[PDB]
């Protein structure tokens, strides 16, 4: 009989090359491991969703108000109204009676540049300006040469006497537990710029939470400036933002299946035809 | 040193077990293989892309006619207008500034139930009907008892003398070239009662498609009625009008490129907001 | 309605579906001749008529066929056939009206007589069937009313044989009484299963040999075909004795039975003047009436009518009908067209004007010389509107048109038109500003109406409570009040909303002719509804009087089928009454008034609506009971009910020709029952002298609309002289109330504003909204799908395969046919690469998990990009970007390798020389054989020389050939510009021919892996590689 | 000059019907609002991502322990290991370099009834069984009968003196904090039946979390019957296993982009040919 492959590699008599590398979880043993800290551990250590997604994502033990500010930074971005374009496309899938998986990867698939792409962006922005010794008035002037708006700088209503809420309890929050916070410094300091120009001009909430995000990075001692400038690039904040709006997403998906929503027809007056003549 | 494993098996001194099993495509030989036949043969038989598709789906080298039936069906389903729900989220994604894929996927998620899945409901219906001895009558009379509309019926305009135009060449075509169409015949009785209880209750191009799918399925002589079964239980009028409406939202996804249309966002005073006073 | 048929079908149905313990000889024993029949082929087919003897009689309608010579009795075959010629084929006059002889029945003779010929008859009432017979059959029988035995059978009851006995058959002797008692029960049994409402059989022979009938007279209820017609076959209704519908006239008898719109048109002489198009049978009826009534007797052309809400296309067909019959002569005096009509309830105007329009602009020819005078005269749902176009139209037309609207009587059209005038336990109260109603069906327009005149009413609270629309889940449906968005709750079954609303007493039935009856029945097994109205219009009789005996019996009022129902101004709108709330407001009806009336036609209580609010202070409440033979409710009811209410100072009746119940109203008044002022008028008095009408039923000359009149003015009923006097005389009543102090006006209130409609305000333009999506390369809206620019009708026709259609729909551009070809090549040589790449890979896994197919596709579809699938996209732009600058191919390749880049599209792993990848020698072969020119496909036959020159297998990839025949393909078919090539190959046409090529691989891997019943996939533990931090 | 449709519903002078209804999230106002509570109550009573949830899903104001065990249950649905298939999925796009966005979605569209379900067809089965009044016993028999597995029974390793760790935690946690666990003590019933049966068939993470979330939603008082029914029913579960194991799903795309992971392609050894001769 042919030799068992299994059974062989048990004695070590073969080699075949693993496929693939994984370094966040370990399921094999007698307990579930993630990222080389047991889930009784973790709970023991009293982490939460910020913990877990330290692990998960940065391989990391984070200090406890860097989990808390991963878990104030999901709560704000959770939801924000059924206009916007995946939430809108989750209502339309669910109202098409699709199940939840398909309903939330509707939505989900929206996000990127235009919409919901503004932390990652507003982080990428502010930290090329301040990794050059530009001042934040050269880089205002810098973007208004390039055409660019600031990342991360305007609102539609919120202005000076009239601050966002969301962005005063994240900016509150990092001030009274980040050890140090540069790049929050530099933005304020744009922020106080832009608001010299139109007051609407604030710092948003995605801006806010990119710089604050990128400083918790470089300053909670966890990583290396490679580490966070690597992960910066990678995506962390685009799955911050996934991660927060999938909550809404999905409860949108719920709303439309409590409220029993038909199928959706988008009318003919809201649609403009110009089609060709012949062609 | 340990044994080298694909060395080994080239010697066929271990065995490991295979964990995928395909039958549609092999790639590894000196030409690309379709379900058996060489793509030259593929090429050189003259057959489209109805024979690729009876090839790569069902195994089976099908007559001209049938494959030219295929075509049609993805031709009449390639677009049904931008308002309806999966051209809605493709459009919506496209103005999101995504890539071709995630729109056209996200348009293709809302395909179920409510939208895209009248194809198979009809022909599941009527074969459902056909196979069991009741009559035509008794088939109508059992829906409307069960409180289930008949799928594959009714129009919002077309009716009696103003017949679907799509319906109509799908109709005519396969006359022409069927050899035996009992499940057709059967929903033509259906929609001569349907309509004489209301002008516009004519054949559905779902319906038609799905009984005349299922006719090609069990006459053309290279399916037995388990197979023919099966492949309608499995999804088959499912991936046809998948297939045929990925074209309509790829052009939409383009259209929207070309048009260069911004990010969208739902107008307020569609949405009525219904929110817990404090709850 | 009732319909009378041939001899012949009444004995064939009879013979075919009588059950009796009787024998019955002569069994499908007849023949059918007919001047264009073949003798030999009726001798051949049915040779039993050569023994015995023959009768032959007439099977045209003919009564008293023995009186007036036309029968024949022991004519042998010589006989017969010497008999039919001076009669068959020319005129035979009977009665008032003359006719040809087209059809003759021959069944063998039987030997009798006087003393063995029986006569039996059932009819139907509204009480039920009534039975009689005499033992004096024959021609001789007379006056058989009060002469015949007669015994009544109730409504869902059985007809016993011992009933028969006893009652029905007591003057015929044993063995005789024996054998009819089963031969009455059997015809009985036929009568009652094959839904008949009248047979005669005159005269019935019995003998020692069996049963014979010789003569059988039948009307039969139409309206029950859907539940007969397997029991009928195709029956035939032959029209009465006179004269053939004419082939125009005979048009509009297939029309009705398209849709439920009703289409009459009948025609008296061609060569009349007046022809009249008025909407609504009892607004035609008025018409009809107000022509004749000063001087119109001999002028009259045709009678007609049409409702029922029609399309655009039937009045359009209509009226070119009308028209065309119109033109058929020249008159010296010229021509007059009446377009009347009341106010319509649910009838759009504009679109039964619209097709007005367009049959008389296109009909210009042939009906100017014979110069016509038209009078329109129309209101109801855009009225306005539709009377503005027409307006416009006959201007533009010149055609003199005299347009007018609501403002004017409905009836000084025919004045202006002739030149008299210048032309220019059952409760009293079924609704209160409290009841809560349930509609049954999904009539989201009724219930919207329903509550704006509820707001307009000032209501608390909204008259619909649920909706019942058995064929979705429960939900809720949102509608407007006033501004404000409610929710109202729709039930899959009727029992939760009944459970869930125990304030609804209201029922209002939107249910079809074919389910009315069983939704009523279910309806009336709950006792919190006291009152339903039946919309549905064809529902049979028989059904009818049974849903009147539950009602009865219950004591739930019933607002009979075929109605618009009714209007309580103030309380209560039931479905489309009123039309739409401009109408209301226009009528008053929302405030109360002191007026109920009592009508039978829809229109023409919306034109009494119309009248009352101008000539009275208003309208209290008003009932349309119906058009139906057994109305659920009768006049008598509705005004014993306005009696007993306080409110009602007047009452107005518009009656109409048929039955006797304006009898039981003047009974009512002599005997002190009915004490209010009454008004009531029957509409008909024209019919009396006419030919024949068909649009009721009266028997009698007291029937008779003039009878009626009469009557009722010699009973205290303020009569007025004609329907023009009506508004005048219902005007002197009130202001003779008013004088006397018992009628108190109160002062106008105005009522509650409703916002416009929407799409309203966008069909007049009124404002505007920005679009906000703007599509270019589908149109669904028009009668035929259209794919940029060119309908789908075209694109079968052109030959235009998937191909054509991806070029319509990607580029809006027809594309020459070899460029669809080799879209379509492309498509078929990227369909699939096996189970091993990526997509494929992750479709494989989704379908193992036992996602559909949408899933498992769209999951392998997201791994296409840069690194997989996104090669030809790739592969194009490095060669165009080459292309473009001047450089060569050497130079292309000596700057991508010092670059650090590989170029896209060269390379392949075991093809590299004198064995070449087939896909792309088949492509090559196509693109060289058609394409008219190929630069860029030269450019990387250069560059593949180069790279093969470095490595055998460094050859032209299929993604690069692809790509840059793609982009040839783009700049040299001549349907692009270079601008637009460009932008096509940016924004990634390419990426969408790979993911469409593809996904037929991807949905063929999904259905491989269903077949196959593969299992959920675990990757082993083993081929992995856990690189797992210490501690962190 | 025709009229504004935004000033002639400003001056209530037309009216149109919302296409749309929500419940879940207002946007429109000074302040963002999360089911009638504002974020800034949000974050003043320390509602946490499982109160946010509950907001957003539930429209309800869940007391701290159930929040708490909201939180528990999706950090233990976090991640488990990179075999599973919709770990293997979105390794498999990430290696192909797509974005986090679409690499996660290709994973979680294979979330369904085989993977990812258990929690809520768990849920289903004992909410059946103990709604139907049938004895732990007869359920285990009833079961067996239909040929149907228990769902949430069962582990491959742990057993009866090796319990799951995560099992153990979650099932402390609901013993100390919910206030009835009737369908938990239901569910522990059925386990010691099948624990005297092999002792692997021990209540799973899946069966625990189902009849542990159907017992807060049934006793937390914030709910009705009918309102936990629904919710059940709609697919609550399906959304806790989703969100759980995005984090995991983000956090394998992360560590596959950090390992700079090439384009993976199947081994042709691990696959089975079978293709027809010529068909
Ligand atoms: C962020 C930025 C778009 C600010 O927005 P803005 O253009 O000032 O205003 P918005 O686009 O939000 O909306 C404009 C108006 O439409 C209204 N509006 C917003 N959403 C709406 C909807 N769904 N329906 C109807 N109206 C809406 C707003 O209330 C606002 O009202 P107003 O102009 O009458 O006061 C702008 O400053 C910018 O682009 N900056 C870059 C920073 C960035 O991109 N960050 C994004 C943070 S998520
Ligand atoms: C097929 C079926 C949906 C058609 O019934 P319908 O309700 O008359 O069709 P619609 O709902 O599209 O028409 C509603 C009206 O809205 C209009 N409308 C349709 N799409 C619209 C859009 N995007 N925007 C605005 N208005 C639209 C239509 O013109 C139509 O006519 P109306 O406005 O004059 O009343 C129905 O008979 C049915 O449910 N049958 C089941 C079988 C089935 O679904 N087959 C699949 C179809 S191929
Ligand atoms: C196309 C290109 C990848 C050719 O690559 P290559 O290294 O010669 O060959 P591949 O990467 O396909 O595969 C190499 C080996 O793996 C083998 N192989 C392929 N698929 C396999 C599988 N699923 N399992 C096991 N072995 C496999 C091949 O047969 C070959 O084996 P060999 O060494 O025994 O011949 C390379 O020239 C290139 O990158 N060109 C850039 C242009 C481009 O990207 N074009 C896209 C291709 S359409
Ligand atoms: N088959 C027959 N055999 C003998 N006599 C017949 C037959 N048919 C009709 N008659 C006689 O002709 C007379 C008139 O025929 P019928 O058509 O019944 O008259 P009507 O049309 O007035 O009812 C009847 O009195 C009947 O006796």
Redesign the pocket.
Known sequence: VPMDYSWARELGLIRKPASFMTSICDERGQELIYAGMPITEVFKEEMGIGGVLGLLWFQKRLPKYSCQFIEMCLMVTAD??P??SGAHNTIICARAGKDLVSSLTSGLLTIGDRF?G??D??AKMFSKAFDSGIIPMEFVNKMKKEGK?????????KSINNPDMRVQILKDYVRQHFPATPLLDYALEVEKITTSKKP??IL????LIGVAFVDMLRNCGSFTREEADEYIDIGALNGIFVLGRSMGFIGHYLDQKRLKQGLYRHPWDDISYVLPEHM
């Not at 708006?149 to 209503?157: F, T, Y």
């Not at 948003?204 to 801006?207: K, L, S």
């Open positions: 924000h109204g206009a916007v919901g503004a932390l962006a507003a708006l600031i990342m991360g700088i305007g609102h539609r209503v609407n001009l948003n909430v995605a801006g």
